Amino acid sequence: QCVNLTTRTQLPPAYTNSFTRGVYYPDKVFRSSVLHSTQDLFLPFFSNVTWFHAIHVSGTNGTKRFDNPVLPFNDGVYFASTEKSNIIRGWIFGTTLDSKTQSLLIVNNATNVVIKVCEFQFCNDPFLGVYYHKNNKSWMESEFRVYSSANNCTFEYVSQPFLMDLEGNFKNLREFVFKNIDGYFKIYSKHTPINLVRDLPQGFSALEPLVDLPIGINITRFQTLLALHRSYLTPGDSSSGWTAGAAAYYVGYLQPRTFLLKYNENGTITDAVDCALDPLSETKCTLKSFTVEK
């Protein structure tokens, strides 16, 4: 059973820039050394993505509280997370998130994944209380406080963990794209080891398709689930949690755009052009080239 946490306090939102991120493979067709134009739901270049910390210290007292605010899900979501201690565990998707309508759960423990679709009666504060054992502490034991009850589940999926194990600044970025089209919840994913970059890295990395669940359910909202290191019985003065939440996660929204993807001989999407971004990109898309003569 879940435990109620302190008030959200209605944190003021913050924004950052998406430096050519969120490109994924739009099909399951192999292409090499080509420039292919696809119209699909992509994250527009240089968009304003909202970022939330894992733990935020806003009060002068030293309060360490979770930042897991509720966000809507319209036409797909780009979800990045920079972490180095695996404080992120999964997501929930749905519209009402209660005993009325069914909802989707993805969680990744230290062993494998759990993906379910049913009417979880989610409470306001779902997470996983984590601890190590006193002898080995090689892997991390978790007690999930996500939902009170779950009934009428018609799905179940278990596979290799979506998130690797991250156990001084070995922070890594994890990118995901979620689309609900034709009853298909398509998740695309990618991982990048990063050096000395706190914010989103400027660069290119396409998201390989991770899974396509034929759930056939209705999604308009979602949440994010984290791991609690400190104790809700005795909140420590400082450093009990994960360093006052250095790790963070960013959210952006997909839009119907036409992109020009460049496939190399190895079949990897090395670069892309967002046609409707600016006149130079439009020229590149009409000429179907990445370089434009005078």
Binding site: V29, F30, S32, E208, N266, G267
Partner: protein, 362 residues
Amino acid sequence: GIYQTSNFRVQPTESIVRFPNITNLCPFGEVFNATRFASVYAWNRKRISNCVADYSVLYNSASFSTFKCYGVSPTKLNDLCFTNVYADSFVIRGDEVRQIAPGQTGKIADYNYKLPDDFTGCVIAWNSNNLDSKVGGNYNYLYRLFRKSNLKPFERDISTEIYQAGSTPCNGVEGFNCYFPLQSYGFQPTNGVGYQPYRVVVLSFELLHAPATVCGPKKSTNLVKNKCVNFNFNGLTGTGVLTESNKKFLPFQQFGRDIADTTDAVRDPQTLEILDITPCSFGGVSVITPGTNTSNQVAVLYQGVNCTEVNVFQTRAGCLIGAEHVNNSYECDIPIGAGICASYQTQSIIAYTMSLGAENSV
């Protein structure tokens, strides 16, 4: 002269088939013969996956009043492979069965169930006057007669809000100009044919470019390599040569397209080896001849092909058959190409490198 007469088009052998190894059986009795047939306002929809479909049994039953396939022919359903199937079942009377078709209008068409104008699939319908009828009347089937707007294709939103047809809403109270949206129908064994119940099952085929889960009863023959074959991979038919490929298809990539309109590579489902598809061969066929007023002998140029696919002389223009190559150089008589010309001289057809003229040092 030289005349383009034909185009040689090397032919295929031993047509091969590479359907998946799936050996399940489709649920055509727990969905197609269910004891409960839902109403059209909430039609029973089942997703069909991973099973082997034999549409010959269903189509060959003679128990159906209606069997209409759109985008596909019922007889050819056995050879095809689909990524997924949808089965939507309901019950309607005869006069409205005509509205289960792409581009049809009417009460049920725009208020209860709407097939898309781009429909690919088969609608099956039969009379159930002996099952759904009641002597006193079976009012358990509900249709929608009024709505704020028509349906988009494949729309199912269950609502009981009484709609206001007058100048003032009644706010959920059944009163004047506020009718109840759900109309029931009085099924009777004595009802007219236009009003007797018919059970309808609509099969929608997902003809996407995805790994086919529902397939027909076909046998996967052994794979043949470096040969011109008629291939049928996952219902995708074609004709060409399959060869070793070093392409790296990531575990989600099935097909391959560097031309974007022809599958130049393919992942075999049985063995996940990926093979590239190069067409067998083709090229022009030219007949080099002197005037028939001189002789009837001819030479044949197979343009742009090596002398293995077909007095055999490999020129840069292709394979020459019936002309002897000579070391001498003359003026061009019949242009063959790439500096090679042909002539008829004593009496055989000769092929030679043309001479540009006599050498002259000033």
